[PDB]
Amino acid sequence: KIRTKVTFHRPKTLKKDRNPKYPRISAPGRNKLDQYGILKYPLTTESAMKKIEDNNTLVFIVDIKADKKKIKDAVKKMYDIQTKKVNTLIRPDGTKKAYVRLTPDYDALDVANKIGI
Amino acid sequence: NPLFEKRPKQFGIGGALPPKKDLTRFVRWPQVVRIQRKRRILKQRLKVPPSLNQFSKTLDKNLATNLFKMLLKYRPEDKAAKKERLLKRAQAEAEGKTPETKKPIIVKYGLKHITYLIEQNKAQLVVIAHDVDPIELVVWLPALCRKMEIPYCIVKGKARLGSIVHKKTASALCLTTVKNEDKMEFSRILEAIKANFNDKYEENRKKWGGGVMGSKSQARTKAKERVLAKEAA
Amino acid sequence: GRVIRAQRKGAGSVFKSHTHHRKGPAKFRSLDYGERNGYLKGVVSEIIHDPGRGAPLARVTFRHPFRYKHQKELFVAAEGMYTGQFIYCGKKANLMVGNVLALRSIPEGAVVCNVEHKVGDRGVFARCSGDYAIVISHNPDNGTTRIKLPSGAKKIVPSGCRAMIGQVAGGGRTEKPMLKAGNAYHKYRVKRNCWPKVRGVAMNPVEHPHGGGNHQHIGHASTVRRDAPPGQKVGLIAARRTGRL
Amino acid sequence: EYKRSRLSRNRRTVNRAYGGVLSGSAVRERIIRAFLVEEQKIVKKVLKIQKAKEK
RNA sequence: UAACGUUAUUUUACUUAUUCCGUGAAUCGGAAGCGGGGCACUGCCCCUCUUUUUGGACCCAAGGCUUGCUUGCAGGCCGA
RNA sequence: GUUUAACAGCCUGCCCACCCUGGAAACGACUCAGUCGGAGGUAGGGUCCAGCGGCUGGAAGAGCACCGCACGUCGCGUGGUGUCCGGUGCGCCCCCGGCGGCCCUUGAAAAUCCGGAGGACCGAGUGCCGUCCACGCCCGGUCGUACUCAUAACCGCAUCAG
RNA sequence: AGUCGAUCCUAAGGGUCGGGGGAACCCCGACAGAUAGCGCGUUUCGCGCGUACUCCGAAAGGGAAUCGGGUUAAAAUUCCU
Ligand SMILES: [K+]
Ligand SMILES: [K+]
Ligand SMILES: [K+]
Ligand SMILES: [K+]
Ligand SMILES: [K+]
Ligand SMILES: [K+]
Ligand SMILES: [K+]
Ligand SMILES: [K+]
Ligand SMILES: [K+]
Ligand SMILES: [K+]
Ligand SMILES: [K+]
Ligand SMILES: [K+]
Ligand SMILES: [K+]
Ligand SMILES: [Mg+2]
Ligand SMILES: [Mg+2]
Ligand SMILES: [Mg+2]
Ligand SMILES: [Mg+2]
Ligand SMILES: [Mg+2]
Ligand SMILES: [Mg+2]
Ligand SMILES: [Mg+2]
């Protein structure tokens, strides 16, 4: 054997991927954050109604754990409407609120009428 | 053809950068390597009492090869052979009315059994590994063999003894009897081993070992001695 | 009944050295085959000021003996060295100011600086501004060179120890009077929290053996035992004499 | 602001050896020094060979 | 003042215990070769490891010999 | 009160720095102060650097001011005119440039980005290999964001002259 | 809120592996040591480099990117154009 480096380096040895005999968890967990759990209920305040009328935007109360991507996906699944952009904030009461602006192809007033506000 | 030319490199202090060289002797080795080398160095440096020093003189190469090729034909049966013999015996028990079988002749192993055979004077030849760790297990075995008048030899490799007896390692092996066709050669090896080890036990009892310094200090001492001799002549 | 200032020094945490703006330790190259047998050439690229150090430092760039890269070093500058100068370090280096040579190759009566104590330690003696060591004699039998240090002491070191030819630059710094407390404040701000100093006789007894009394005075001999325990060992420690010469 | 996606190549490149790193005078000095030092090395080697032949 | 023996204080030798220093543990010990000097005659002993007018560059081998087979190229020795 | 944002293009080119011609005492040039010049000054001609500089697009369609018509309870309605031309400075706030004074004081690091030395290796003939060029296409998470900041929203037991 | 900040970087320092102490709670802190890994081509294997912390530490240090105009009872360089 010929060594050109004075420093000794640990040789590379094979590693094996885990192949457990039994699964630690019997079955995959349930999807807690589904679309129904993501979308709690729409907001029916005066400001929300003004947003719907003017900016073609819906106002929703959403699970605090939900992100903008999940909110967009849940809105699409629930109401079959595209979203131009989702803005989010956490109210002082601790709940998450989302302003979801629909694309021009969709009418916020018609969507709200279908929802039932 | 004329476009090829030599580009010699001038290697030296301040010259062209040297090519890759052998740096093995300068390697910063791991702790295990360093300690196992320093242990050998320390054992060489320190004086070895005669009882331990007697284990440095092993059987010669030719004698060891002859002894071990003799031993290879007395190996104990392996697991497969044992199972095959047991199943044959079970099958033939009732049918053959338990026919008599000749007593097997095989090498004996296991420190307990070897010591018992030596004490009972049943052993005819004892083979002791030179690298037993801890060595207190076999340091007294040469003395016991000498007292019991049992020829003993010290050979290289507990791993080789273990390979003889189908084990990873074996502290020692023993032969209690040999076959008729092998008695003469066994007697030859026995006389050789007795002349090599048993007859030299008394002289080796007083011979200390070790005390060997490093090569560099040896060279320094030789240079000093040469200077002294040149001055004295 | 209270720990004195000298005692509190050892724990540190307010008496640690101020080293935030320092440029790293100043030392010779690691001793290698080139310096042991032949010589190696570097170039002085910069002369810099090291805060808290009177002597200027010199940045020197060397060519690595066996790697394709630059070897960067920081030497204690010797008086007379300049940017762009060639420095030669090794046993065969010429006897010129700024070169680093083994003491075995330095003739007697030579002035050197940053002298090694142990072969390869990279320099521990005569490093302050304006200081130098003098080569006295050589002993080939045991391979030892004798040197005179700045304090005047004579020391025997192995002849393989290296040293830079010449004296340390920046000499004469201490001649200038400071004239005011602000200059000392600035000086020690980059060194350590050792200034100003309060006299022991100005303290109360609880925090100094010299403290107390209706008059300011020590009240007992200021010379103390070499084996006096910490907290009691103040004043002139193990003084063989006192007063004027 | 020097990032390639933000600044044009001509604005951050100088068309010369060591362009953008060394000044023109520095590059000229380096070229002259290299040439003259190599010439002096050749001269020294030739002188050494001639001296060896003479002795 | 020595043959025998006891005692105490010093000087000195070895390196592996121990302690310390340096390094990215990068040429350590011996010998032999390439070159330079003298001797008298074919051998001896004495030395060197290649870099000092310049604020440059310097790595990952050219070359030779030898194998697979006829080279996409690949494997060895010297170079070292 | 009489306004012009980010951003894109073109122009310009402070004080410096740099380049070409040329070779200077009767020395010259030059700043408030300095300073510079055969190691190449003055002079002539150029390059580059800053800009919170100029023009254009943005952008007059916007904002502002003025003058009108109309619903007169709910048209966030409807229309026109102008937004122009100069001066001044040891002025005040901010940014920048270039000198000079001071130190026994010389006044951070890293992420990140740009550039360079070398050239192993790499492609075809009507298509191949590259391309930091122009245009086109898609996406961009999580948390904070109200309000006071004090002779009552902080601390001082308070809506406290601190 | 892709464009304002945190988030990223490191400062004084803090917290640690191994090692060394310690009855032990714990103490020192990269100092007693086979480091993390990083590039090239790929039958995913080979080749080449690889100095023992790729951790915390700044809403005033360093640092990718937004501007007008308009809008609310209360938000905006975040909402509208
Ligand atoms: K106390
Ligand atoms: K102080
Ligand atoms: K005082
Ligand atoms: K007193
Ligand atoms: K007094
Ligand atoms: K901007
Ligand atoms: K390149
Ligand atoms: K806000
Ligand atoms: K505040
Ligand atoms: K421990
Ligand atoms: K540690
Ligand atoms: K920050
Ligand atoms: K806007
Ligand atoms: Mg290592
Ligand atoms: Mg007094
Ligand atoms: Mg208008
Ligand atoms: Mg290139
Ligand atoms: Mg309270
Ligand atoms: Mg531990
Ligand atoms: Mg990090």
Side-chain angles (χ1 to χ4, degrees), chain B residues 127-175:
Chain B
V127 188
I128 306 158
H130 90 299
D131 56 349
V132 178
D133 214 81
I135 197 154
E136 289 113 332
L137 285 157
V138 309
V139 71
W140 50 265
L141 247 180
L144 176 57
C145 296
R146 214 265 191 300
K147 183 150 188 73
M148 294 312 262
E149 308 280 292
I150 308 305
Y152 73 94
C153 59
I154 307 182
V155 299
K156 263 148 167 37
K158 60 179 169 184
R160 187 166 61 151
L161 303 196
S163 212
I164 293 281
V165 293
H166 300 105
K167 299 289 187 276
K168 275 178 270 189
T169 57
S171 85
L173 304 175
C174 182
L175 269 170

Side-chain angles (χ1 to χ4, degrees), chain C residues 4-85:
Chain C
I4 68 174
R5 172 191 60 215
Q7 275 183 297
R8 298 200 289 103
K9 297 266 174 114
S13 77
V14 286
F15 304 107
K16 286 161 83 24
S17 180
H18 308 161
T19 60
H20 184 61
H21 290 287
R22 293 186 184 186
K23 321 287 185 243
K27 50 187 171 177
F28 289 141
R29 298 179 63 260
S30 282
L31 191 47
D32 58 1
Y33 179 85
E35 270 189 75
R36 276 195 306 267
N37 298 105
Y39 71 81
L40 294 171
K41 175 173 81 75
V43 60
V44 174
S45 73
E46 239 192 335
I47 285 89
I48 58 175
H49 164 91
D50 182 28
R53 189 205 294 276
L57 301 182
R59 289 192 192 281
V60 188
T61 299
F62 288 90
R63 179 177 173 240
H64 199 278
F66 58 83
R67 284 184 204 274
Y68 181 61
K69 75 207 288 179
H70 289 353
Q71 199 173 45
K72 282 192 165 46
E73 310 287 329
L74 184 70
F75 291 3
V76 169
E79 181 125 346
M81 76 172 32
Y82 55 98
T83 51
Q85 193 199 323

Side-chain angles (χ1 to χ4, degrees), chain B residues 203-223:
Chain B
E203 98 188 23
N204 286 344
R205 248 185 74 64
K206 267 70 73 203
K207 184 202 165 339
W208 280 73
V212 186
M213 300 307 115
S215 62
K216 292 193 234 199
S217 86
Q218 257 170 248
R220 270 177 260 121
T221 295
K222 247 58 83 195

Side-chain angles (χ1 to χ4, degrees), chain B residues 42-60:
Chain B
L42 183 65
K43 278 200 225 154
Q44 273 180 279
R45 298 282 170 286
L46 296 177
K47 276 162 160 31
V48 186
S51 208
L52 291 163
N53 191 44
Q54 81 199 340
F55 279 90
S56 96
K57 295 146 273 172
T58 54
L59 202 48
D60 304 316

Side-chain angles (χ1 to χ4, degrees), chain C residues 3 24 33 36 53 97 112-113 115 127-128 134 145 164 171 180 198 204 222:
Chain C
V3 182
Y33 179 85
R36 276 195 306 267
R53 189 205 294 276
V97 166
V112 300
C113 69
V115 189
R127 295 155 54 86
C128 290
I134 286 165
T145 306
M164 163 166 304
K180 42 184 177 146
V198 180
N204 297 306
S222 41

Side-chain angles (χ1 to χ4, degrees), chain A residues 38-44 48 52 57-63 71 74-75 78-79 81 83 86-89 91 95-100 102 111-112 115 117:
Chain A
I38 288 159
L39 299 179
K40 307 277 189 45
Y41 58 88
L43 196 62
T44 69
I52 279 163
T57 294
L58 303 157
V59 183
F60 277 108
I61 299 311
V62 167
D63 199 284
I71 288 158
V75 162
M78 197 87 45
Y79 307 120
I81 58 195
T83 283
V86 180
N87 280 350
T88 59
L89 71 91
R91 301 148 89 196
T95 55
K96 185 167 274 202
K97 163 163 67 169
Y99 305 102
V100 183
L102 305 170
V111 167
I115 294 168
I117 44 188

